[PDB]
């Protein structure tokens, strides 16, 4: 009864950051040191906990959030950060207890003509609350005039495309990101380590 971390990290296709995918993990045992000592992850940063202690800890639930961004935006997936990804796509709480794992996926998520299947939100009136999700595509109204659902002056499409190319720089290459949140409620902790 191993925790199904394999189908989260080794998934064939990944979600867009504006429509990030959440998977709940419970009722299983998980070996976190194998995570920290495999796949040569580019970034592996834990807040409020350490992987060695995580291997001897128990939690009520574990949420794994998966998406794809560019490398230069990976630092936005962290508590107290600002920017397009942090503000309008995926926001972490200031009290975030959990880990953030990111690895380069140029060989998977890049195409010679440009991979435009990955989108990020560029326009939003207010910053997202922590763990809030917005997959709406309503035309952003920048002026006082109504937009009526058509692109035009003061009427922008909210989403923008990365257009990943293999020849791009590392900071502009596709990185796959998995965020592990550890929820500990007043319930029996069903997901633990060895």
């Amino acid at each position: 009864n191993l925790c199904p971390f394999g189908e989260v990290f080794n998934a064939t296709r990944f979600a867009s950051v504006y429509a990030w995918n959440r998977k709940r993990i419970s009722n299983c045992v998980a070996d976190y040191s194998v995570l920290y000592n495999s796949a040569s992850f580019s970034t592996f940063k834990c807040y409020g906990v350490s992987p060695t202690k995580l291997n001897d800890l128990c939690f009520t639930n574990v949420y794994a959030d998966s998406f794809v961004i560019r490398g230069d935006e990976v630092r936005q997936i962290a508590p107290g950060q600002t920017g397009n990804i942090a503000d309008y796509n995926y926001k972490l709480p200031d009290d975030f207890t959990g880990c953030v794992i990111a690895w380069n996926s140029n060989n998977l998520d890049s195409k010679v003509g440009g991979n435009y299947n990955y989108l990020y939100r560029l326009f939003r009136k207010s910053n997202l609350k922590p763990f809030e999700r917005d997959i709406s595509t309503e035309i952003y109204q920048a002026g006082s005039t109504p937009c009526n659902g058509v692109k035009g002056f003061n009427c922008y499409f909210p989403l923008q495309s990365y257009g990943f190319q293999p020849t791009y720089g590392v900071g502009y290459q596709p990185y796959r990101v998995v965020v592990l949140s550890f929820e500990l409620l007043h319930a029996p902790a069903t997901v633990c380590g060895p």
Epitope: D72, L122, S126, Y156, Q160, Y172
Partner: antibody, heavy 118, light 108 residues
Framework: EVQLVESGGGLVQPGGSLRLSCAAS????????MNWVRQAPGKGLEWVSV???????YYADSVKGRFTISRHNSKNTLYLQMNSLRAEDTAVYYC????????????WGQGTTVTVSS | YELTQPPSVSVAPGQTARITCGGN??????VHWYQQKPGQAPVLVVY???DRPSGIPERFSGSNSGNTATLTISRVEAGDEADYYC???????????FGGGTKLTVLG
């Protein structure tokens, strides 16, 4: 009717303070990317600051810790407070709308001059 | 981050002028070209590397190849004499980076 009108520039002694105002017509400042961009006399354009629609702010290294971008929705006006001024800040300051990530900066102000000299 | 532009480009009236902009990550970035006539404020003449803003003459075209962005002005008239700047948003330093500026002078 789509215009940006700047004001508040002038002569300031080194180490002084000065506030620049940019009144907008034709779009809403609070829901737009708004930039302050300066240009020293004879030199090229230098980006100074940007404010996001959600409130996040970014500043250039040259003005970090001294300048502050802000907005007032009641007057639909962008503001740039500038403290601890030095001679190198002597420039014409424009306000503009847009983000360099997409669609660029389309509407620009006429610019106001700021001279820091004793 | 640095955007590299030739300081000067000179072209006779009616000929075609090309202004280049080089950067390490320009291929992944959206390049915007602005024109500033002497004494006036900058005006946006190219956005998203190839898109013409409303009101800009069709002779102003944006091109992107590899890590070089080229602003091409066809059938150059004397009124186009101005300083042209390429601009991107660099996410390696969270900055809006401007090119050095190119002085397009129509040869008379």
């Amino acid at each position: 009717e789509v215009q940006l009108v700047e004001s508040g520039g002038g002569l300031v002694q080194p180490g002084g303070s000065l506030r620049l105002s940019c009144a907008a017509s034709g779009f809403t400042v609070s829901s737009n990317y708004m930039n302050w961009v300066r240009q020293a006399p004879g030199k090229g354009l230098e980006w100074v600051s940007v404010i996001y629609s959600g409130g996040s702010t970014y500043y250039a290294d040259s003005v970090k810790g001294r300048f502050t971008i802000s907005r007032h929705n009641s007057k639909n006006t962008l503001y740039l407070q500038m403290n601890s001024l030095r001679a190198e800040d002597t420039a014409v300051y424009y306000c503009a709308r847009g983000t360099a990530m997409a669609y660029g900066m389309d509407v620009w102000g006429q610019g106001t001059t700021v001279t820091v000299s004793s | 981050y640095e955007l590299t532009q030739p300081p000067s480009v000179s072209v006779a009236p009616g000929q075609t002028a090309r202004i280049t902009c080089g950067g390490n990550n320009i291929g992944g970035q959206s390049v915007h070209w602005y024109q500033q006539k002497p004494g006036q404020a900058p005006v946006l003449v190219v956005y998203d590397d190839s898109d013409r803003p409303s009101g800009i003459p069709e002779r102003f075209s944006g091109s992107n190849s590899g890590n070089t962005a080229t602003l091409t002005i066809s059938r150059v008239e004397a009124g186009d004499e101005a300083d042209y700047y390429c601009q991107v948003w660099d996410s390696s330093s969270d900055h809006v980076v401007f090119g050095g500026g190119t002085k397009l002078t129509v040869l008379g």
